[PDB]
Design an enzyme around this catalytic site. Structure first.
Site: not given
Ligand SMILES: CCOc1cc(-c2nc(-c3cc(OC)c(OC)c(OC)c3)cnc2N)ccc1C(=O)O
Ligand SMILES: [Cl-]
Ligand SMILES: [Cl-]
Ligand SMILES: [Cl-]
Ligand SMILES: [Cl-]
Ligand SMILES: [Cl-]
Ligand SMILES: [Cl-]
Length: 252
Positions: A12-13, A18, A129
């Site tokens: 995802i990122g 991630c 945060d």
């Molecule tokens: C490094 C980031 O840590 C976390 C990730 C998530 C988390 N993020 C997503 C997520 C899904 C996306 O798809 C649409 C997306 O694109 C816009 C996105 O962008 C950042 C993120 C999905 N599920 C997740 N659990 C959650 C929490 C954290 C964190 O560490 O606080």
């Protein structure tokens, strides 16, 4: 327990990357955060262990849920497994609105207000945060606070107390900033340098949020941005607002 209990679908990122993953046992969709600890010292690994135990503790519908931790000692990689938030983060929602010139629904802002206020209340109860990038949306209209927080950028959301010294009402100001940005698609105080920014915060003046938003919503956001911490509403006073209804809360 083991990496092989899960299959990576895609990234995802990218603190490592991630990835969206699928738990083999039942096909549940999750994500994990991938951290290479190979270059870390013993001390650092120790406080990493401390942080991870901390995340395993907090359980709440409006806090991103931890599931598992996986150590891959061969590749010196640690995986933190958590719930999948299909709606992504709030930063992308604001950017999307900014770029496409479309304000968000009041109903959406009320949901964020209600559910983040309950996340805060839980955080305060225990002892993160409050910024758009640390706020996540699931597929069911739920809003969740992430774990970011537990130089180059301008500290847009910093309260007047923090800018000098030295407080849970500070969190209320930060929420005010976040909700303000959600409505206006820009922060309440903007500037090119931190010193310019600090000058603006001290004046405590800003534009009204757009007229498409009710006087009632403008009023509570404005109260959160009061220069005096003791004039900002507490979490309890926020939730008592006639604006906030059952449907704005989380649903499974
Ligand atoms: C490094 C980031 O840590 C976390 C990730 C998530 C988390 N993020 C997503 C997520 C899904 C996306 O798809 C649409 C997306 O694109 C816009 C996105 O962008 C950042 C993120 C999905 N599920 C997740 N659990 C959650 C929490 C954290 C964190 O560490 O606080
Ligand atoms: Cl617009
Ligand atoms: Cl609206
Ligand atoms: Cl305006
Ligand atoms: Cl309804
Ligand atoms: Cl429930
Ligand atoms: Cl939920």
């Amino acid at each position: 327990s083991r990496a092989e209990d899960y299959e990576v679908l895609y990234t995802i990122g990218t603190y490592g990357r991630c990835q969206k993953i699928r738990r083999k046992s039942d096909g549940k969709i999750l994500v994990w955060k991938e951290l290479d600890y190979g270059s870390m010292t013993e001390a650092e690994k120790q406080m990493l262990v401390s942080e991870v135990n901390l995340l395993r503790e907090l359980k709440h519908p409006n806090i991103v849920r931890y599931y598992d931790r996986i150590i891959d000692r061969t590749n010196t990689t640690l995986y933190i497994v958590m719930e999948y938030c299909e709606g992504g983060d709030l930063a992308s929602v604001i950017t999307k609105g900014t770029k496409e010139r479309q304000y968000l629904d009041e109903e959406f802002v009320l949901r964020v207000m209600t559910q983040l206020t309950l996340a805060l209340k839980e955080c305060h109860r225990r002892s993160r945060d409050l910024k758009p990038a640390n706020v996540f949306l699931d597929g069911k209209q739920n809003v969740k606070l992430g774990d970011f927080g537990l130089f180059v950028g301008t500290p847009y959301y910093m309260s007047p107390e923090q800018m000098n010294r030295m407080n849970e009402k500070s969190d209320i100001w930060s929420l005010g900033c976040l909700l303000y940005e959600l409505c206006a698609l820009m922060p309440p105080f903007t500037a090119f340098s931190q010193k310019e920014l600090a000058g603006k915060i001290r004046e405590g003046k800003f534009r009204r949020i757009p007229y498409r938003y009710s006087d009632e919503l403008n009023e509570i956001i404005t109260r959160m941005l009061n220069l005096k911490d003791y004039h900002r509403p507490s979490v309890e006073e926020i939730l008592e607002n006639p604006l906030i209804l059952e449907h704005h809360h989380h649903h499974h």
